[PDB]
Amino acid sequence: FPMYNGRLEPSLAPALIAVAPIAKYLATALAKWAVKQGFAKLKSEIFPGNTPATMDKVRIEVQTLLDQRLQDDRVKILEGEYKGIIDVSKVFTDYVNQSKFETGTANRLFFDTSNQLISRLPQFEIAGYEGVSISLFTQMCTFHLGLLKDGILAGSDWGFAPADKDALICQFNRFVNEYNTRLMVLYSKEFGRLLAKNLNEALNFRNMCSLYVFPFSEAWSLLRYEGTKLENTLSLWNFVGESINNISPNDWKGALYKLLMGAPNQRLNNVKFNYSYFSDTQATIHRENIHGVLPTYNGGPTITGWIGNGRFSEITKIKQEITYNDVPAATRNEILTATVPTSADPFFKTADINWKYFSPGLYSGWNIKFDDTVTLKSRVPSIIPSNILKYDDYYIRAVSACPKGVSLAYNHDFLTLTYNKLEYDAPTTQNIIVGFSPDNTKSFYRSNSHYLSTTDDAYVIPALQFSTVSDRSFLEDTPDQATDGSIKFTDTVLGNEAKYSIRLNTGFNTATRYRLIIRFKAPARLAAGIRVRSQNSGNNKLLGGIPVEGNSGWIDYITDSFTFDDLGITTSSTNAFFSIDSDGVNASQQWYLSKLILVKESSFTTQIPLKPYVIVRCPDT
Amino acid sequence: NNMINFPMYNGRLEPSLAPALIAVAPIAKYLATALAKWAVKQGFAKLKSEIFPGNTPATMDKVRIEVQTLLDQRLQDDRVKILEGEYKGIIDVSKVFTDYVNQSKFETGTANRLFFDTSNQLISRLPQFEIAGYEGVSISLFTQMCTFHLGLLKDGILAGSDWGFAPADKDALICQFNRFVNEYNTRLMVLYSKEFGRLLAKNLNEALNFRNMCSLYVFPFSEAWSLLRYEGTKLENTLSLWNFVGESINNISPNDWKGALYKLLMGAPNQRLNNVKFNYSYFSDTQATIHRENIHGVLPTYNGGPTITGWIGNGRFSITKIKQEITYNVPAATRNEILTATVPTSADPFFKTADINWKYFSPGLYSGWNIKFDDTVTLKSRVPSIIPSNILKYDDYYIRAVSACPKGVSLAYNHDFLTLTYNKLEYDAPTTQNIIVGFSPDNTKSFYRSNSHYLSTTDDAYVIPALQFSTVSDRSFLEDTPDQATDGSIKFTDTVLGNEAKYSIRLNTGFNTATRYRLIIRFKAPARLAAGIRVRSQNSGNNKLLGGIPVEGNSGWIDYITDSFTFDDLGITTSSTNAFFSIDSDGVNASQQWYLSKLILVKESSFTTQIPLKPYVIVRCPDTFF
C-alpha cells in the first residue's frame, strides 16, 4: 500500500486548503485596509455568497485531516449559529452599502451583529471536540475583530460618538488578547491530550493548526496596524517509526521541540543514522532498527549531538557472520549517512522513509530515501511500501528524532541554543522525524542572511533566523506567532543579545525611510531596557531604547523613522546587522523575542490605538 | 628510581630561589620606576648602577650563577673569562661617559664624543653574548646588555643639545632606537626559540624549566623595551610558571607546543581553577609483590566559560569508582577511581602550594603517585613504601591551572579546532602519566577572583592582558607570545562574522570619574583591514566609540593611543556593574589574521610619548649603506 505520510490518500496541498483565500485577503487587508469595506470583504471570504459553504469545507477538511468528527446534533447547531451570523451580518452590510442611510440605524444594526458574535462565539469552543472546533473558532474571532476594526474607523459614519468609538477600541484590545488566550486554551487542551496519546498524532494536530489556526492568530496581532506583512514560517513535521506516547507539554517545551529544531538558523548538511541489522541462524528473523539520529547543520552557533546513541551495542561499519552447531548468524552495525547535495538549492525536497513491522514478528525493517538517493533499502526479504513525505511549496529543513525508552524531563535547563551540545542520549529511537519548512524561508537558509528588496512594503525577520546569539539563551515554542519559535534570554551576569545579518539587493533605494517593529514579551521591569541597534563595518547606530516597565503580553515597539543612508548600509555592504541587546536578567526578568518587522514609513500606520482617545480609561464595573 | 631519599622541591634536592629575590629583580623594579617617570639625563646613570653596581660585574656574575644553577647548564671557563673582559670594557667606557656628565659644568662637544664611545662599544661587544650552543645561559646575559644599550640611547635622545646632539644628530639616535628595539627583540627570540625548541625535543620538564627562567630573567625586560619609548605606563609581568611531575616526555615540536600543548595547559585562560579530576588506576598481584598506580588522564574544570574544557588523556576505565578483589587457584586487586581535587570556596579561592610526586622503584614492582594540594590529600600512594615529598611552590604565586600532557599520541592533530570557544579543549590519549601545575603571579589574583578589572584612581596605569577577557568571538585561538610578559595573545581568525572581545571593568569606591584617561592598544595586524579595528566601551546600553584604528598592514606590534576621555563621558560610575571595553573588527581571511596583546589604561597627565616612531627633522632615516 503506497502511503502518503502514513495515509492511503495523499493529503491536500497546503496552498489549496479552504482557509487559503481568507488568509490571502488578510495579507492584502493588513497591507492596506479598506475603510468601511474591510469587514464586508472579510465577510465575503468567510461566508461567501451569505452561505456557510466555506465553514463546511473547512470542517470536512479538518475532520479528514485529524480523523475527528463532530456529532450530527452539534453540526446542525453550528449550522443554525452560522445562519444567525450570516443573517445579522448581511442586514448590517446591505444597509450601510446604500447611497444614503441613517447613522443612528446603522449603529443599532452594528450592535446587533457585534453582540450576535459575542453571544454565539462559545458555541465554537466545543467541549471534548476542540481539536476540530479550533479551526472554526479561529474564523469567528477573525469575523468579529474585523467588524470591530471597521466600526472604529467609521465612527461618526456609523453612529459612534467619540465615547462610543473608545468603547469599541476597548473591546478590540480586550478581544484581541482574549480571543488569543481562548485560542491557546483550545490548542493546549488538544495538543496536550495527543502528546500523551500518540506523538505522530500530536504532530498531525500541530500541522493542522500551523495552516488553519496560527496564520490567523498572527493576523490578529497585525490587525492593529496597516502596511505590515502577514508571514507564516511555521514548520510541518512528519513522524515515521514506532509509536511514542505519554509525552507531557513540559517535555515538549523544554526538550523534544529543541531537539527537533536542531540549529534553528542553519540548513541541513547531513544526517546520520545508527543502523543495526539482525538475522537468526534459521534465516527466518530479519530485524532492522534505528538507534540514533545525528543531524549536522550548516553552521553554528548551535552544536548538535546524538539523539539516541551512536553506539554499536570510531567504527563506521562492522559486519559479522557466525556459524553454530546445535542466536544471530548475521550482524551488521553501520552508521548510515544522508548528505544534502551541494547545489544552488542545497535542500532536500521529498523523502521516502517508512517502517514496517510484519504480523508474525519475524520481519521488521526500515526504508530511508531523500529525493532520489537511497540511503537504506531494507534487507528484509520482502518489500516495504513507499511512504512519500512531502508538502508542496515546502522543503526539508531539519531531520531529527525523539528519544525512546527515556524520560524527556531531564536537562531542560541545559538544552540551550549555544555552548551546550544539543543532544539527548537514549538506548534507541526507532523513529525519524522530518521538518518541512515553507519555501519563503528558503532564501535565508540558503544565504544565511536576510536580503531586502526596495519593492517590498514589509519584511518579517523571525527571531530564530539569527546570525549569532548570547549564551544561556533558549528556544521557546510560540506557534501563535506564525513562526517556528522565539528566543528566551536568561543570562544573569553578561548581556543578552542577538544579531541578524541583512543584505540589500542591487537597486535598493537606500534613501527610503523605514521603521522597525520589535515584538517582545518582557514580564518584569528592565532598568537599562532593551536596545535596538544596527552594525555595519564599525558604524554602530542606535535605532531605539525600549523602555520596559513590565507587561505579561506581547509588546510591539515601533522605532523612529530611519533610512539605510543614515545607517551607512549600501548594496556592497556585506557586514550589515540588526542587534537587539539588553543587560543581565534574573529569573523574573527573563524576556522573549518574537520577530522583527521592517516596514516603510510611508505605508505603515497605527490605525487602532492601545489607549482610548477621549475617555480616561476603558469602562469598569 | 634514584637511590637518594631527600625531600624534593620541584624535583630538585634544594629549594629554588624565590622569584622576587633573583638577581635581576632590582633591575626590573627600577625599569618599572623609569617607565612611570623617566629621569632625564639620569636614566642611564641609574640603570648602569643596577646592571653594573659599583662599576663591577658582580650582578652579571650573580645572574650567571643563578641561571646556571636553575638550568643545570654551565658556560665554558674560557667563555666566562671572555665575558669578564667584555664586561670590563663596557664598565670602563660607560664610567668615563658617566663621570664627565655628572660634573658641575662640561663641554657639550666632549659629552657627544664619549656618548658614541659607549654606544658603539655595546654594538660591537653585543655578539659576544649571543654564544652559540649555550643560548640557555647566554639569553639572560644578552637581555641585560640590550637593556643597557637601549637605556643609553633614550637618555641621549631626551638630552639633545645638553649632550651635544644637533637636531640631525638627535634624529640619528631615534632611528637607532627604533631599529634596535626590534632587532634586539628579534635576536632575543632567536636565542629563546633555539633553546626552548631543543629542550621540547629533549625533555618536557626541562623545557618548562627553561621557559620558567625566561619568564623571570628575560621576558620582563623585553616588555620593558616596548614600553621604553613612553612615560607613565606600568611594567607588568603576568607570565605563568609550569612544574612537571611524572614520566619523561620528549620529541615535542614547537608547532606541537604552539598549536596544542600550551592550549591544553592554559585551559580557560580567563578563569580560575575550580576542580581537577584525575583518572586513577591501582593494580596489585596475587603474590602481594606488585603495586602499580597510574594517572591515565587529567580533567580541569575552571570557574566559567566561554572555554569548554575536556579530558587530557582519557576518563575511561580500561562510573566514579570500582573496586575489584579476585581470588585464583595475576591481578588480585584492581581499583579504578576518578579522583577529584576541589579548590576551596573562600575569600581566596586558589591553591597556593602542591605536593605531587611520582616514584618508580628500582625492581619495577612499585610505582605510585602522591597528589596533595595545600593541606588536603587527594591521593596517598597505596604502595607499601613511602613516596618522598615534592613541594611545588613559588612565593608570591598561586596555583592557577592544573593540566597534563597527552602521552602516547602525536600533538600535531586538531590544531585548527583547539580554539578558545565552541570546541571542547581536549586531547584524547591512552595515558598521561604526568601532572602539570600552573603558577600565576599574585598580581592576577584580583581579576581571577572577581572576573573583572577593578580600577583605582590612585593608579597611573593599569595593564589589561588579552587573555583576561569576559567574552571572545568564535574561531579565536591562543597565541603563545611570551615576549609580551603575558600568558599569550588572542588570534582572531573568523572569516565571515566579526572578531571582538569584551573586557569587564569596574571602578573602585572613591574613583575620580572626571579625570582624563587614554587607552593604548597593542596589536599585530599583518594585512590591511578595510574597516580597521574599533575600540569601544559598553555600559548598560551606552556604547561609546573610543577610536577607529586605521590598519594598513605591518609585520610588527603596533601601539595605538586613542584620544583622551573620561568615565563621565562613558557613563561609568562606581555602581556600574555592566561596564566593558570592546575591541571589534570585521571578518578576516587567512592573510588578515591579526593578534591582540594587551590594553593599557593611562592617565592623560602622566602619559607622554618621549621617543617618536618617525624622526623630526630629516625626512627619512639614514640607512646602513656606505
Side-chain angles (χ1 to χ4, degrees), chain A, chain B residues 2-619 621-626:
Chain A
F1 33 88
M3 291 186 299
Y4 300 89
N5 194 20
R7 298 174 166 272
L8 270 65
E9 298 103 325
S11 301
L12 178 62
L16 296 176
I17 59 187
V19 303
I22 307 179
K24 289 185 176 180
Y25 162 72
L26 285 176
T28 309
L30 292 181
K32 180 57 181 180
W33 179 270
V35 181
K36 296 164 61 177
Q37 282 181 316
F39 171 72
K41 312 186 97 62
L42 179 59
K43 167 178 167 294
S44 60
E45 292 294 344
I46 300 182
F47 301 110
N50 306 315
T51 65
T54 289
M55 296 298 102
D56 290 327
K57 183 60 172 173
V58 171
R59 184 181 125 274
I60 60 101
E61 288 176 7
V62 179
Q63 284 189 2
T64 299
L65 185 57
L66 297 191
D67 200 63
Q68 308 181 16
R69 289 136 276 170
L70 295 170
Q71 297 288 314
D72 292 9
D73 45 304
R74 215 60 168 89
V75 170
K76 290 134 188 174
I77 290 181
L78 297 181
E79 174 188 346
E81 309 300 328
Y82 285 144
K83 300 184 191 304
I85 294 171
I86 291 174
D87 286 352
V88 183
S89 56
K90 180 184 181 298
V91 174
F92 170 78
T93 296
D94 296 353
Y95 184 69
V96 301
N97 281 121
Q98 298 175 346
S99 181
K100 191 168 187 174
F101 64 97
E102 207 265 321
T103 66
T105 302
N107 175 270
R108 162 211 144 197
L109 293 178
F110 180 93
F111 292 141
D112 294 356
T113 304
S114 182
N115 289 325
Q116 196 76 219
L117 298 160
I118 297 180
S119 61
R120 295 178 183 264
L121 249 181
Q123 228 70 19
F124 299 93
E125 292 169 319
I126 304 180
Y129 297 91
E130 41 272 68
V132 179
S133 75
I134 183 176
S135 58
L136 303 177
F137 176 83
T138 308
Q139 293 301 323
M140 301 298 101
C141 298
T142 310
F143 190 81
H144 186 250
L145 293 185
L147 176 70
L148 298 191
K149 178 173 182 177
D150 251 0
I152 296 166
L153 305 181
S156 58
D157 297 7
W158 286 359
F160 299 113
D164 297 329
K165 176 176 181 175
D166 288 359
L168 294 180
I169 301 178
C170 288
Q171 289 182 273
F172 178 85
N173 305 334
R174 170 194 162 179
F175 293 147
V176 75
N177 292 277
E178 181 176 324
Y179 296 162
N180 183 274
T181 301
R182 291 160 60 178
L183 184 72
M184 299 300 301
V185 168
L186 301 180
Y187 168 76
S188 300
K189 278 171 175 271
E190 185 72 3
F191 187 66
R193 177 187 74 91
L194 294 184
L195 275 180
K197 170 173 170 52
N198 186 270
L199 177 56
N200 181 29
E201 179 166 354
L203 290 175
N204 188 81
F205 172 76
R206 181 188 169 93
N207 301 332
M208 187 277 305
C209 296
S210 303
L211 298 175
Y212 286 92
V213 174
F214 289 133
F216 306 100
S217 54
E218 165 73 357
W220 300 345
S221 59
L222 294 178
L223 201 60
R224 178 177 310 279
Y225 323 102
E226 154 184 300
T228 65
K229 179 179 182 178
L230 180 67
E231 176 168 313
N232 180 22
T233 55
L234 264 167
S235 294
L236 306 174
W237 302 87
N238 295 337
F239 183 92
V240 174
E242 291 182 12
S243 305
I244 296 180
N245 53 6
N246 286 325
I247 296 181
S248 74
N250 292 322
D251 295 350
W252 167 274
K253 237 76 174 186
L256 182 49
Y257 189 58
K258 302 174 178 178
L259 310 171
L260 299 177
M261 286 298 298
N265 62 331
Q266 300 293 341
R267 88 180 91 102
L268 185 70
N269 174 252
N270 72 92
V271 56
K272 297 176 176 301
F273 306 87
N274 189 12
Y275 166 82
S276 70
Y277 167 75
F278 160 76
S279 192
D280 72 321
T281 183
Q282 293 291 346
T284 65
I285 303 180
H286 301 264
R287 292 200 175 98
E288 293 176 316
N289 297 265
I290 299 299
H291 299 286
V293 172
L294 176 57
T296 301
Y297 298 95
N298 212 73
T302 310
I303 168 177
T304 59
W306 274 102
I307 295 132
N309 56 31
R311 299 180 287 260
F312 289 162
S313 183
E314 262 57 43
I315 290 87
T316 292
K317 178 186 61 179
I318 171 160
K319 308 178 184 181
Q320 260 193 341
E321 303 183 14
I322 313 182
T323 298
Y324 312 90
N325 280 340
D326 209 336
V327 288
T331 298
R332 185 191 197 98
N333 293 25
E334 181 178 1
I335 295 299
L336 294 171
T337 302
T339 304
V340 175
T342 60
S343 59
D345 213 9
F347 310 96
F348 283 147
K349 283 77 185 178
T350 61
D352 195 339
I353 311 178
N354 189 12
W355 144 260
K356 185 175 187 175
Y357 170 86
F358 288 71
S359 41
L362 310 178
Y363 293 174
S364 60
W366 282 83
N367 277 8
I368 302 180
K369 179 181 183 181
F370 298 92
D371 290 359
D372 290 326
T373 65
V374 177
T375 291
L376 167 65
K377 179 182 177 183
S378 181
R379 311 178 199 275
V380 170
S382 54
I383 243 59
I384 290 189
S386 182
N387 186 29
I388 298 95
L389 303 181
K390 76 104 56 185
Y391 293 96
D392 289 327
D393 305 317
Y394 277 75
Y395 73 96
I396 297 181
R397 213 281 304 185
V399 179
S400 175
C402 182
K404 209 187 199 309
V406 295
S407 176
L408 297 169
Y410 298 106
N411 290 19
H412 286 190
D413 275 60
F414 288 90
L415 290 173
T416 58
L417 296 175
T418 57
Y419 201 68
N420 305 9
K421 182 181 286 286
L422 185 52
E423 59 182 353
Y424 215 93
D425 191 78
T428 183
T429 59
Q430 205 66 12
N431 70 93
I432 302 171
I433 305 179
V434 186
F436 287 85
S437 197
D439 285 358
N440 57 2
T441 66
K442 197 146 60 181
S443 172
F444 170 81
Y445 287 102
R446 182 202 300 105
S447 61
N448 304 113
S449 185
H450 296 263
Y451 281 77
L452 308 176
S453 299
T454 188
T455 61
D456 304 332
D457 281 358
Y459 187 93
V460 184
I461 300 182
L464 297 189
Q465 292 188 1
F466 56 91
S467 179
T468 184
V469 74
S470 58
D471 291 333
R472 294 303 302 170
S473 58
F474 294 83
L475 187 150
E476 187 71 25
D477 186 14
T478 57
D480 65 329
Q481 306 296 321
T483 56
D484 266 328
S486 300
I487 303 182
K488 180 181 183 181
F489 295 98
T490 65
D491 197 312
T492 165
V493 177
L494 304 187
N496 297 261
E497 76 161 336
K499 302 178 183 177
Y500 298 87
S501 180
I502 48 179
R503 294 281 184 83
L504 266 49
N505 294 317
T506 59
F508 187 92
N509 192 327
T510 63
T512 47
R513 305 181 61 88
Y514 286 92
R515 280 191 174 185
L516 254 181
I517 310 173
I518 315 300
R519 189 179 297 179
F520 66 98
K521 178 182 292 183
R525 189 188 78 93
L526 303 180
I530 305 177
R531 289 83 63 175
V532 182
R533 311 182 202 271
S534 63
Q535 311 170 14
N536 176 78
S537 299
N539 188 24
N540 290 17
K541 249 70 175 182
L542 179 71
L543 284 314
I546 314 180
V548 176
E549 299 297 332
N551 194 308
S552 59
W554 291 100
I555 303 302
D556 288 316
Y557 175 82
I558 313 164
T559 77
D560 294 324
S561 182
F562 65 96
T563 182
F564 285 98
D565 286 326
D566 291 332
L567 307 183
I569 300 178
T570 63
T571 290
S572 59
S573 299
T574 60
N575 285 266
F577 283 100
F578 273 157
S579 176
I580 313 293
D581 56 315
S582 67
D583 285 10
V585 294
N586 53 43
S588 60
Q589 296 165 338
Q590 294 173 354
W591 57 286
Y592 309 85
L593 178 57
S594 181
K595 68 193 64 180
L596 274 62
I597 299 184
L598 178 68
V599 291
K600 293 182 174 181
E601 186 190 22
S602 59
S603 57
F604 181 68
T605 298
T606 309
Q607 288 177 308
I608 301 183
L610 293 172
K611 292 168 294 183
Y613 290 111
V614 178
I615 66 180
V616 176
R617 64 188 302 195
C618 292
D620 286 72
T621 317
Chain B
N2 202 335
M3 54 191 300
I4 301 179
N5 195 84
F6 263 59
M8 288 187 297
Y9 295 88
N10 195 19
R12 297 176 165 273
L13 270 62
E14 310 90 357
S16 295
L17 174 57
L21 304 179
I22 60 185
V24 304
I27 312 176
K29 292 185 178 181
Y30 164 73
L31 284 172
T33 304
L35 296 181
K37 184 55 185 177
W38 178 271
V40 184
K41 292 144 62 180
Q42 283 182 325
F44 172 76
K46 311 183 103 61
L47 177 65
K48 168 179 164 294
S49 60
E50 288 292 344
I51 303 179
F52 299 109
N55 303 317
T56 60
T59 290
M60 290 303 106
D61 289 325
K62 191 76 174 68
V63 174
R64 176 183 140 272
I65 59 100
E66 285 177 11
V67 174
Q68 286 186 184
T69 300
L70 182 60
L71 251 57
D72 194 59
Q73 302 181 20
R74 303 163 198 84
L75 249 44
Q76 297 288 322
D77 295 10
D78 42 302
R79 216 60 170 88
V80 172
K81 286 121 185 175
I82 291 181
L83 296 178
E84 172 180 341
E86 308 297 331
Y87 284 146
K88 177 186 178 303
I90 296 175
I91 292 173
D92 289 353
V93 185
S94 60
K95 176 177 176 293
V96 177
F97 171 78
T98 292
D99 293 359
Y100 184 76
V101 181
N102 273 326
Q103 71 190 35
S104 184
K105 198 167 186 177
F106 56 93
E107 199 263 341
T108 61
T110 301
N112 175 86
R113 176 185 71 260
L114 303 180
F115 185 90
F116 298 109
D117 292 1
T118 312
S119 179
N120 293 327
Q121 196 68 229
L122 294 158
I123 303 177
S124 60
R125 297 178 184 266
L126 256 183
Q128 226 66 24
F129 300 95
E130 290 167 310
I131 311 177
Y134 298 89
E135 294 84 345
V137 180
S138 68
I139 185 179
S140 62
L141 309 180
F142 177 80
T143 306
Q144 294 297 330
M145 302 296 100
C146 295
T147 308
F148 194 79
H149 187 242
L150 290 184
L152 175 64
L153 303 186
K154 174 171 184 172
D155 236 1
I157 290 176
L158 297 184
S161 59
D162 295 356
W163 293 358
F165 295 116
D169 304 325
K170 179 180 177 179
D171 287 5
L173 292 181
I174 300 178
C175 300
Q176 285 186 107
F177 176 86
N178 293 333
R179 170 198 168 183
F180 285 146
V181 74
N182 297 280
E183 178 175 327
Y184 296 163
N185 186 277
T186 297
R187 290 159 65 177
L188 183 70
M189 297 301 299
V190 168
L191 308 169
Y192 168 77
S193 300
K194 284 187 185 186
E195 180 71 356
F196 184 69
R198 175 184 78 94
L199 296 182
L200 276 178
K202 169 177 171 52
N203 184 271
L204 176 57
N205 182 25
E206 188 166 344
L208 293 185
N209 180 267
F210 174 71
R211 182 190 173 96
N212 290 338
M213 183 272 302
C214 299
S215 300
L216 291 171
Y217 286 92
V218 172
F219 292 136
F221 306 98
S222 62
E223 164 73 357
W225 301 345
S226 63
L227 302 174
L228 201 56
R229 73 172 69 260
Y230 310 101
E231 163 182 302
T233 65
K234 182 179 181 180
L235 178 58
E236 179 167 315
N237 184 13
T238 54
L239 258 169
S240 294
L241 309 181
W242 303 93
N243 290 7
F244 185 95
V245 178
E247 295 186 16
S248 304
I249 294 179
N250 51 11
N251 285 316
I252 299 181
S253 87
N255 304 313
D256 296 351
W257 165 271
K258 232 76 173 186
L261 179 54
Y262 188 60
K263 304 175 179 180
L264 303 170
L265 297 182
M266 289 293 296
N270 65 324
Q271 298 292 343
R272 79 178 105 97
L273 186 66
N274 181 259
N275 66 87
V276 189
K277 294 179 178 299
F278 309 91
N279 188 10
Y280 168 83
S281 69
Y282 169 78
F283 162 73
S284 189
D285 69 327
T286 182
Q287 316 176 29
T289 64
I290 303 181
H291 301 262
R292 292 202 173 96
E293 296 178 326
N294 294 268
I295 300 295
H296 300 284
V298 172
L299 176 55
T301 298
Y302 297 93
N303 206 83
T307 307
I308 166 71
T309 41
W311 275 98
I312 297 127
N314 60 7
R316 309 184 296 258
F317 287 163
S318 182
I319 298 94
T320 295
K321 177 188 63 179
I322 171 169
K323 297 186 234 184
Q324 271 189 332
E325 299 189 15
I326 310 180
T327 298
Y328 302 107
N329 269 337
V330 279
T334 302
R335 188 192 200 97
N336 292 33
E337 181 181 9
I338 296 299
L339 296 172
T340 303
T342 297
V343 174
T345 57
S346 59
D348 211 13
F350 314 98
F351 285 145
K352 283 82 190 67
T353 63
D355 189 0
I356 307 177
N357 191 19
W358 143 264
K359 193 180 191 305
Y360 170 87
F361 286 69
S362 39
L365 280 63
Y366 295 173
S367 60
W369 284 86
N370 274 11
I371 306 182
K372 175 181 179 180
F373 297 90
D374 286 347
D375 292 327
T376 62
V377 180
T378 296
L379 166 62
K380 181 184 175 184
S381 181
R382 310 172 200 274
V383 169
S385 53
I386 242 58
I387 286 188
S389 185
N390 189 25
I391 298 97
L392 309 182
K393 139 197 180 66
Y394 293 97
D395 291 332
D396 303 321
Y397 277 69
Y398 68 97
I399 295 183
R400 216 281 298 179
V402 177
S403 176
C405 182
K407 201 186 203 306
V409 294
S410 175
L411 300 177
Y413 297 107
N414 294 20
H415 286 183
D416 274 61
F417 293 92
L418 289 176
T419 62
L420 296 175
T421 54
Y422 201 91
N423 307 36
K424 184 182 286 287
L425 182 58
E426 59 175 355
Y427 216 93
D428 186 64
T431 310
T432 65
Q433 207 59 222
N434 71 90
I435 303 177
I436 300 181
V437 185
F439 287 92
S440 190
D442 278 355
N443 57 358
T444 65
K445 265 199 181 70
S446 178
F447 173 79
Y448 285 103
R449 187 201 302 103
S450 62
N451 304 112
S452 190
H453 295 263
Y454 282 76
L455 307 171
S456 296
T457 185
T458 61
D459 300 328
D460 275 356
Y462 187 94
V463 184
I464 299 183
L467 298 183
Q468 295 187 8
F469 55 85
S470 172
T471 188
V472 72
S473 60
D474 285 332
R475 293 300 298 175
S476 60
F477 293 87
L478 188 148
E479 191 64 36
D480 188 16
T481 61
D483 58 336
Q484 305 293 334
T486 61
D487 268 335
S489 296
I490 302 181
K491 180 179 187 178
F492 294 95
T493 66
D494 197 311
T495 167
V496 179
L497 300 187
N499 298 262
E500 74 157 337
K502 300 178 187 178
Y503 297 87
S504 185
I505 49 178
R506 298 282 241 276
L507 264 48
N508 288 120
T509 63
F511 189 91
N512 194 333
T513 60
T515 52
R516 305 243 289 172
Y517 287 92
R518 279 190 174 182
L519 252 181
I520 308 176
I521 324 292
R522 189 178 302 178
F523 67 98
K524 178 184 296 180
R528 171 170 198 281
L529 304 180
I533 305 175
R534 286 83 66 181
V535 183
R536 306 186 200 269
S537 67
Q538 311 169 12
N539 176 71
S540 300
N542 187 21
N543 290 17
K544 247 69 176 182
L545 177 70
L546 281 312
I549 316 176
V551 168
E552 280 185 338
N554 190 270
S555 60
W557 292 100
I558 306 302
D559 288 321
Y560 177 82
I561 305 163
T562 72
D563 296 326
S564 182
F565 64 95
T566 183
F567 285 88
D568 284 332
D569 290 332
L570 306 187
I572 303 177
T573 62
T574 290
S575 58
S576 299
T577 54
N578 292 263
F580 287 96
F581 271 152
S582 179
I583 307 288
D584 61 80
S585 76
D586 289 10
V588 295
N589 56 43
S591 57
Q592 299 171 331
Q593 290 174 350
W594 59 286
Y595 308 80
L596 177 63
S597 179
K598 69 193 64 179
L599 276 65
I600 302 181
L601 183 67
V602 290
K603 292 185 173 180
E604 186 191 25
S605 62
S606 62
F607 179 67
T608 302
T609 305
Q610 292 174 320
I611 304 180
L613 294 176
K614 301 188 306 176
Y616 292 110
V617 180
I618 59 178
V619 183
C621 280
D623 215 340
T624 57
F625 212 58
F626 317 93

